[PDB]
Ligand binder design. Structure first.
Ligand code: SAH
Ligand code: SAH
Ligand code: QOI
Ligand code: QOI
Ligand code: NA
Lengths: 319, 319
């Protein structure tokens, strides 16, 4: 049936997880045809059982079968690279913490606590729990770094960064957005604000330990907020954009950059943001509405096309 | 993207799970259009957050949206019935025990210990663990009961049960197959062999606590073995069929009934049998081979069509 295979959709995720997390996928580099019998002798993986997994991977379109051998498909070459963002995605997707968060999702819909399904399972909100968990934090921060590394080339193309002097990336994570921007845009003051127990170090990057719910530091003329607001509710999103308006002067600009809600694409991510953060995906006009409540105005609006999702580039300034 | 939504396939299962497990799907009986605002006041679910889950269910084809109201699809009416086979399926599919089993699947490929990924996660083989876990056993036994109730109509159609006198259903679970056969085929002796701590009770069904790995009891002219062999290896499958031969005489008949591997259908179930049992999916000829190794001869092979999978009906006698 099609409904029973829809019920059994998790089996598709778990099969890819077993293929990628073990490191078996890293034997399929440069679109080579792998002999599974030779892979069995080299790595010690069970020939008969892994051959059954490969047949299911061929069904999913991850592998391609020819000449009694298997290659990764054109689109699934990323699984050969353990450094790829797709590798970090599946490692987090069906991990025990996410699984337990999903099992509290149903129950979380009836609660008016303000606690996410993640918090009900674990006892702390996502980012606070990550502070005491290397696995979740390292994989999450790594994923955020890879997607930051992918988009940066297009950001520099669509927006002139040389017109600015003092740049702050609010919730910048490991800080790879401004590090890569600073390499191609020279002789500027660069700062990255996030929650740091230990401050990261990089040449001409000012790492700040702070909280964007409490306050943003003033005196900067370019502010960046990439993939933050979709981890928050409307009220918290307004509170963040309010703290920008207090900090920002007349000359200042805020680049609200985020994955955007387009009808054509999947709502699956919208549900994940509800489970992990009690947040949501938003459209251009939804982002614009929250900005208007905070006391900000939309000057420019452009779309950035990434492989996995469309992005919403919004240049905001104060009233 | 197509790759990231294949990676995020677990989100479909988990979204259906939250919809069914809570009992929100039971409000969508007989294809009625549910107002979510009305459902919010009645049951107490968050309006905005459940509305977002419904929009994702519309994308999956579980719900249909017309005039800001949601009904179940023609195929997905089953989710309205909490005692449906599909309702028990999703309740087991992404439960913590299955999740932890899948997370040991990758590691289990490199072991030649004879331990399933389930046993590696939980410390005992599947059925032995179900003895000390009512959640898994009651849901599993219930699922096996519902699929037994679905097939019995077609099974009575394609085989003459009136010719037989003494009937034993080996690994018959709660015994719903023989109970439904006994209701229409009257005046026969009926017995259901399985692993019972406490014997089930039913009108003229002889429930036997036993072990088909150890021996099958002799003195029956009809034997049934439905959806057992796909929970076992080839050697264990041969051991069971050998125990049938030693039990059976020249006039005896064994109905080997099981979900069969057809190229057209998904390999997803084959991987689940590997994770849970170290079992496998098998074709007609593969089933035929194991029977011939055990010293059984095929009399009559037929195909039974079911909604979710094709079934192999193999009549076996000794020689
Ligand atoms: N109260 C808070 N103050 C500052 N940073 C916070 C915060 N709550 C969450 N964050 C940070 O917000 C980030 C959200 S993920 C986005 C990371 C980065 N901007 C990127 O696009 O790749 C995380 O790095 C998290 O640590
Ligand atoms: N060693 C053993 N001896 C007897 N029954 C066993 C067994 N190991 C597993 N079983 C039983 O085999 C069944 C597998 S599921 C099949 C149940 C039923 N025949 C149906 O098709 O619906 C379970 O009920 C399980 O309890
Ligand atoms: O894959 C992503 C992701 C990709 C691109 C941009 C993103 O922001 C994310 C993101 O936030 C995210 C997440 O919060 C939790 C996840 O398990 C996975 C992802
Ligand atoms: O849905 C089934 C199922 C359906 C029909 C016939 C079956 O045998 C099964 C079965 O065995 C099974 C299982 O062993 C574990 C599961 O999580 C789900 C199922
Ligand atoms: Na390896």
């Amino acid at each position: 049936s099609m409904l029973t295979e829809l019920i059994a959709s998790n089996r598709r995720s778990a099969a890819i997880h077993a293929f990628v997390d073990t490191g078996l996928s890293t034997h399929f580099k440069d679109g080579i045809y792998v002999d599974i019998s030779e892979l069995s002798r080299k790595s010690g993986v069970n020939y008969a059982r892994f051959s059954r997994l490969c047949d299911f991977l061929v069904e999913m379109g991850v592998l391609v079968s020819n000449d009694n051998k298997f290659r990764l498909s054109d689109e699934c070459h990323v699984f050969a690279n353990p450094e790829s963002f797709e590798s970090f995605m599946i490692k987090l997707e069906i991990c025990s913490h996410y699984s337990n968060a999903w099992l509290m999702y149903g129950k979380s819909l009836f609660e008016d606590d303000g606690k996410s399904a993640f918090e009900m399972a674990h006892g702390r909100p996502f980012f606070e729990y990550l502070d005491g968990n290397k696995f979740l934090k390292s994989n999450f921060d790594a994923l955020m770094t890879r997607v930051s590394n992918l988009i940066v080339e297009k950001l520099l193309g669509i927006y002139d960064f040389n017109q600015h002097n003092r740049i702050l990336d609010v919730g910048g994570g490991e800080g790879e957005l401004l590090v890569r921007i600073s390499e191609k845009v020279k002789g500027k003051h660069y700062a990255v604000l996030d929650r740091y127990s230990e401050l990261p170090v990089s040449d001409n990057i000012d790492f700040i330990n702070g909280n964007f719910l409490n306050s943003i530091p003033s005196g900067y003329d370019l502010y960046i907020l990439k993939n933050v607001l979709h981890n928050w509710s409307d009220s918290d999103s307004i509170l963040i954009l309010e703290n920008f308006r207090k900090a920002m002067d007349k000359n200042s600009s805020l680049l609200l950059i985020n994955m955007v809600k387009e009808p054509e694409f999947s709502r699956s991510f919208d549900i994940l943001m509800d489970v992990l953060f009690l947040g949501k995906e938003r459209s251009f006009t939804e982002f614009e509405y929250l900005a208007n409540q905070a006391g900000l105005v939309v000057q420019e609006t452009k779309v950035i096309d990434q492989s996995y999702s469309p992005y919403s580039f919004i240049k905001l300034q104060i009233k």
